[PDB]
Structure 1
């Protein structure tokens, strides 16, 4: 058990092993309570996240457990990974704080798109990496559900990782089938988000900047057109079905006339991602084989994930139970090799 030291960073206490030096807060809140730090074991910059009030309620406790289970699972070049997880607590009794250590990324894609206009080469490589990360996440029956430019981070080498900073509107990147509340949705909600992201990388503009869930739905249908009988037949919600069918019909736009001057291959992939019918939307694994990625695509180098035990998601437990389970996960953690 290493030696810890204490300090106070922007109205927050931090008790970290001495191996982590020069803690410097980052993102002024956008990422949570996160410090850049120098890791003396590796000689690399890292990010250290202190969980806020991790065991305040059953719901915080379950969220804390979930985040640690997800981070301990992710072992892929295009998904954030756990370098370390620690607590200053010597016992389960004293256990009240959780610190997660990850790679420090250079910039989020929101800052990249807002600051820079991207080339087709850079779009190919960034979307290839998102899809490669998604293939991996999806193979474990994990759905991100929150994909947006601020949840993607890039290094100066253009190496991309998928993250989720939690709480640029999520709304703008969200699949129409999980816009009005209901349970008919698959992993391809994430492929819709990737389409919205790729559009914004290609054009410099939010594709669908809805002011609310109704506006958002109107902006989507204006590009992809109102559903035919085929898709209408699969909408269980009378109230959603009444809303959609209450709209004046709208044709599917020719995407080549919307994304004028884009690589036609980019336009073809976008057509395959921004399909209203989530049963007909391209999967991550399918998208990686698209002729848009010919330069990057290597079927022997697009790994899937080990299975992930999500069975806790259905469980209703007490704070102290979720806390004990989280403590177990802290103790059993095996760092990745240096």
Structure 2
């Protein structure tokens, strides 16, 4: 058992193995607190996340276990995986804090764009990697559902890793079916997000700048058009159908016009991602074969994930059960090569 050392950072107490040195806050929110640290074992900077109050409630307890399970399963170059997980506690009885460790890339997509004007080749590489990671997570039946530039870690070689998936402004990249609260959705909500991100990288501006969700929904419908007979056919709720038609009264926008000077292939791909009907949206695996990624696509190097056991998701357990399951996972953790 490594020796730990305590430290107070921005009001929050951090107790970590001496292995991690020079803690530096990067990170704060409802998801927990995040610090950058120097992993002296490998010589590389890492990201350390201290979960808020992991076992405060059943919902907290379950999401603590969830994130631990998720990270322990992901092993892909475009997806954050678990480098280490630890707790200062020596027993289940004293177990109250959980720390997760992963790669620190250095910047997020917003930062990259802030400093550099992306070339079309940059766009293919960045989106290609997002889609490649997405094919992987989606294959394990996991959905990000909050894909956005701040959830995209990029290193100085513009290589990318998807961050904080399977856990959930955010709205700009959110799929319309979510903003409309239509129930039971699919993996392509992430594809819609990728479309909003890609458009942004091409035009340099937010595609659907809605002050609120309604304003934004009107902007979405204005661009991808009123729902056809086919889509309206799958919406049961009469109130839902009427309301959506009521939001598509803005003058129609032409898709090609919005993305003028961009690569023709880029625009075609954008059209296949920003489809109102999620059943007709291109999937990540399909997207990877699109001609826009000709220079990067390789079917022998775009793997899917090992079977992921998430039967715990349809389980309603007590705090102490969720806590014990989490503790067992912390103990059984074996670091990667």
* TM-score in terms of structure 1 length: 0.95
Q: CA deviation at 1:184?
A: 4.1
Q: CA deviation at 1:64?
A: 0.6
Q: Does the residue aligned with 2:127 lie in a helix, a strand or coil?
A: helix
Runs of 5+ consecutive residues of structure 2 not aligned to the other structure: none
Q: CA deviation at 1:195?
A: 0.3
Structure 1 residues 252, 73: CA separation in 2 closer, same or farther (over 3 Å shift)? farther
* Contact residue 226 and residue 250 of structure 1 kept, 8 A: no
* Contact residue 226 and residue 251 of structure 1 kept, 8 A: no
Distance 2:190 2:248 in 1: 28
Distance 1:201 1:70 in 2: 29
* Contact residue 144 and residue 168 of structure 2 kept, 8 A: no
Q: Which residue of 2 aligns with 1:274?
A: 274
Q: Which residue of 2 aligns with 1:53?
A: 53
Q: Which residue of 2 aligns with 1:239?
A: 239
Structure 1 residue ranges, 4+ long, deviating more than 3 angstroms after superposition = 27-32, 165-168, 247-254
Q: Which residue of 1 aligns with 2:10?
A: 10
Q: CA deviation at 1:167?
A: 10
Structure 1 residues 244, 28: CA separation in 2 closer, same or farther (over 3 Å shift)? closer
Q: CA deviation at 1:269?
A: 0.3
* Contact residue 51 and residue 98 of structure 1 kept, 8 A: yes
Runs of 5+ consecutive residues of structure 1 not aligned to the other structure: none
Distance 1:188 1:28 in 2: 29
RMSD: 2.0
Q: Does the residue aligned with 1:301 lie in a helix, a strand or coil?
A: coil
Q: CA deviation at 1:274?
A: 0.4
Q: CA deviation at 1:33?
A: 1.4
Q: CA deviation at 1:220?
A: 0.2
Distance 1:172 1:237 in 2: 25
Q: CA deviation at 1:176?
A: 1.2
Structure 1 residues 144, 28: CA separation in 2 closer, same or farther (over 3 Å shift)? closer
Structure 1 residues 23, 248: CA separation in 2 closer, same or farther (over 3 Å shift)? closer
Deviations along 1:280-322, one digit per CA (max 9) or x if unpaired, are: 1100000000000000001000000011112111111111111
Q: Does the residue aligned with 1:300 lie in a helix, a strand or coil?
A: coil
* Contact residue 191 and residue 282 of structure 1 kept, 8 A: yes
Distance 2:28 2:185 in 1: 34
How many correspondences in the alignment? 337
Structure 1 residues 117, 20: CA separation in 2 closer, same or farther (over 3 Å shift)? same
Distance 2:60 2:168 in 1: 24
Structure 1 residues 290, 308: CA separation in 2 closer, same or farther (over 3 Å shift)? same
Q: Which residue of 2 aligns with 1:326?
A: 326
* Contact residue 146 and residue 168 of structure 2 kept, 8 A: no
